[PDB]
Amino acid sequence: GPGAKKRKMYEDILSHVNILKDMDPYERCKVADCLKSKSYNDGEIIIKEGEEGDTFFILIDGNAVASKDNKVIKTYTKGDYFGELALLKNKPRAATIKAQNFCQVVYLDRKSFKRLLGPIEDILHRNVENYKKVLNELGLDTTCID
Ligand SMILES: Nc1ncnc2c1ncn2[C@@H]1O[C@@H]2COP(=O)(O)O[C@H]2[C@H]1O
Numbered sequence: 001g002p003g004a005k006k007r008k009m010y011e012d013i014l015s016h017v018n019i020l021k022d023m024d025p026y027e028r029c030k031v032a033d034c035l036k037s038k039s040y041n042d043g044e045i046i047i048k049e050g051e052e053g054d055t056f057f058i059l060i061d062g063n064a065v066a067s068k069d070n071k072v073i074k075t076y077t078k079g080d081y082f083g084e085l086a087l088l089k090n091k092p093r094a095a096t097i098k099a100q101n102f103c104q105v106v107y108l109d110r111k112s113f114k115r116l117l118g119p120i121e122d123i124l125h126r127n128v129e130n131y132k133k134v135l136n137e138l139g140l141d142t143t144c145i146d
Pocket residue numbers: 047053066073074081082083084085086087092093094095096097131132134135144
């Protein structure tokens with residue numbers, strides 16, 4: 001794992017991540033104990049639409065942008081999350097997410113995501129349903145949602 005050191009930094013970060021706000025401190029500590037970190041350079045693809053996905057991300061520093069069939073669907077900043085949909089639906093990545101500067105993320109693999117973010121699955125599902133608004137506005141496929 002991280003070590004007592006990184007682990008407390010992770011817990012600091014998670015206390016300000018909106019998607020985890022309904023967790024209690026015990027639950028967030030469990031998430032922190034399993035996180036890993038990595039970085040992306042400007043222009044690098046973090047998630048490519050159509051590929052298989054096994055990783056959940058929280059963006060902890062930087063700026064990234066999501067697009068689907070060459071239309072911009074979301075801008076991302078510190079505290080945002082992405083990459084949950086492939087894990088929840090067992091489908092290919094639904095959008096491409098690209099770094100627009102030097103980006104730092106923390107991440108979980110599929111099994112850890114399901115176990116550790118179990119406490120908030122209702123919130124994750126509601127937010128998945130909410131993706132439909134922009135997809136329909138832009139005339140994009142919504143079967144990736146349901
Ligand atoms: N409107 C949207 N519809 C679907 N996925 C979106 C949308 N906006 C952002 N995303 C994110 O883009 C990610 C691409 O990979 P996933 O499909 O695993 O998870 C997806 C979501 O986290």
